[PDB]
C-alpha cells in the first residue's frame, strides 16, 4: 500500500509499505529516502504519535494515509 509522508520542508514523499510493517521498518524507509536516523525521527498520524514496536494495521493506516515527520527539539 502507498502512504504519504510530509517531510521537514513540508514536501510530501511516497512510501510503499504493508499493513504488517512495523513502525521501525517505516522509519528505515524514511531513512532510505530523507537520510534521517530512525532514533531522531518522530511520526504523527491523525494527531497521535506512532510508537516503535507496533504495526501500521494497529493505527488504521490505509492506502493514501498521511504521516507527518518531526524531530525532537530537546529542552
Amino acid at each position: 500500500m502507498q502512504i504519504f509522508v510530509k517531510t521537514l520542508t513540508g514536501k510530501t514523499i511516497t512510501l510503499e509499505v504493508e499493513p504488517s510493517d512495523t513502525i521501525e521498518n517505516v522509519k528505515a524507509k524514511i531513512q532510505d529516502k530523507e537520510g534521517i536516523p530512525p532514533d531522531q525521527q518522530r511520526l504523527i498520524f491523525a494527531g497521535k504519535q506512532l510508537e516503535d514496536g507496533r504495526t501500521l494495521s494497529d493505527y488504521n493506516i490505509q492506502k493514501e494515509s498521511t504521516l507527518h515527520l518531526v524531530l525532537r527539539l530537546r529542552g
Partner: protein, 331 residues
C-alpha cells in the same frame, strides 16, 4: 519553580492554564473521579496531579495579589509529581533528561483523552467528556487529484496540531500554512499510484480544514537536515489568523494569538524552553494586566507589553529564543 530538567513540561502547563476551557474541564473530570473514588488507576493520577497543580497556581496568584509577604519559599510548586505520573504512562520521561515540549503536549492530551473515553464508557455502561475534542482536535480533508484521469480521492483525518516548515528546501505564517495545506504536485520519485489508472502518475494534493478546534496549535519545524540543524530564523507571526483560504466552507471566524512556546539554544540536542501567554481573562490589579503578556522564566513571571513582545518576536531583531509552538484562540 523548576527542580531540574522540566522547562518543557512547565511551558506546556503554563499555556494550558490559560486555554479557554481546560481549567474547568479538568475540574469536571477530577470531580467525577473523586465521586468514583468515594463510591468505591494510573490514568486518574494524571487528572488528580493536574488538579493539584492548578489549585497550587490559583493559591500563588491570590497570594501575590493580596499577601506578597507570604509563600517565601514559593510553597514548593511541583510538576515533579505530574512527571512521575507521566513516567508511569510513558518510559521516555525517566531521570533528568531533556525532551520536546510538543511530545509532552501530545502525551498529556492523549492520556486526558483516554481518561475521558474510559469515563464515557463507564457512564454509558450505567457531555463534558469531549474536553480535548472541543479544544485541540480538528478534522482535515486530504484531496488527491490524479493528473492522468482527473479523479479526486478524499481522506478525512484528525489533527491536534499543524506542523509547518520554517524555511524552503523573510517568510510569513501564511506561507508556512500554504506549504502545509495548498496544492502540491507529487512528481518524479514520489508519483501517486492511481487505482483507476493501475499506474504511477503525477497528482495534485491539497489539504483543507473542515472542523476547527477552539485552540489552533501550530508546530513550527524550526529544524532541518543539512548532522541535524536548528533553524534559528523565525517567520513573521500574525496576531490574527484567518483560515478561510484552506477551508472546505467559507467562515467569518478569526483566530487570535494568545500563547507561544520558545526554545533558546543553537542545537536540537539541548536548550531552554520558555512560554509567553496573553492574559485575555482570568483584586483590582488582576484586571490591569489584561491585554498584556506574561513571560515565564524558570520561576520568574515578567509582565511585558504586546508591542515589545511582538518586536522581540519579529526577525528584524535577533530573537535568541526561536518560536516553536504558536497557540491561536477562536475570537
Amino acid at each position: 519553580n523548576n527542580l531540574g530538567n522540566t522547562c518543557y513540561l512547565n511551558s506546556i502547563l503554563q499555556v494550558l492554564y490559560f486555554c479557554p476551557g481546560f481549567k474547568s474541564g479538568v475540574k469536571h473530570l477530577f470531580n467525577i473521579i473523586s465521586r468514583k473514588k468515594e463510591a468505591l488507576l494510573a490514568s486518574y493520577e494524571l487528572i488528580c496531579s493536574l488538579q493539584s497543580l492548578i489549585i497550587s497556581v490559583e493559591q500563588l496568584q491570590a497570594s501575590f495579589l493580596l499577601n506578597p509577604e507570604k509563600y517565601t519559599d514559593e510553597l514548593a510548586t511541583q510538576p515533579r509529581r505530574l512527571l512521575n505520573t507521566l513516567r508511569e504512562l510513558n518510559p521516555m520521561y525517566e531521570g533528568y533528561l531533556q525532551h520536546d515540549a510538543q511530545e509532552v503536549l501530545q502525551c498529556i492530551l492523549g492520556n486526558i483523552q483516554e481518561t475521558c473515553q474510559l469515563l464515557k464508557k463507564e457512564e454509558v455502561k450505567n457531555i463534558g467528556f469531549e474536553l480535548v475534542e472541543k479544544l485541540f482536535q480538528g478534522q482535515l480533508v486530504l484531496r488527491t487529484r490524479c493528473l492522468e484521469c482527473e479523479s479526486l480521492t478524499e481522506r478525512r483525518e484528525d489533527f491536534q496540531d499543524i506542523s509547518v516548515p520554517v524555511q524552503e528546501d523573510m517568510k510569513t505564517l501564511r506561507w508556512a500554512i500554504s506549504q502545509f495545506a495548498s496544492v502540491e504536485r507529487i512528481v518524479g520519485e514520489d508519483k501517486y499510484f492511481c487505482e483507476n489508472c493501475h499506474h504511477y502518475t503525477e497528482a495534485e494534493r491539497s489539504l483543507l480544514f473542515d472542523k476547527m478546534p477552539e485552540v489552533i496549535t501550530i508546530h513550527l519545524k524550526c529544524f532541518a537536515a543539512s548532522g541535524l540543524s536548528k533553524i534559528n530564523t523565525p517567520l513573521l507571526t500574525p496576531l490574527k489568523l484567518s483560515l478561510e483560504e484552506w477551508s472546505t466552507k467559507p467562515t467569518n471566524d478569526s483566530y487570535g494569538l494568545f500563547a507561544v512556546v520558545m526554545h533558546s539554544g543553537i542545537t536540537i540536542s539541548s536548550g531552554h524552553y520558555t512560554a509567553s501567554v496573553k492574559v485575555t481573562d482570568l483584586v483590582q490589579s488582576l484586571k490591569e494586566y489584561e491585554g498584556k503578556w506574561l513571560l515565564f522564566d524558570d520561576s520568574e513571571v515578567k509582565v511585558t507589553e504586546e508591542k515589545d513582545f511582538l518586536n522581540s518576536l519579529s526577525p528584524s531583531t535577533s530573537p535568541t529564543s526561536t518560536p516553536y509552538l504558536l497557540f491561536y484562540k477562536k475570537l
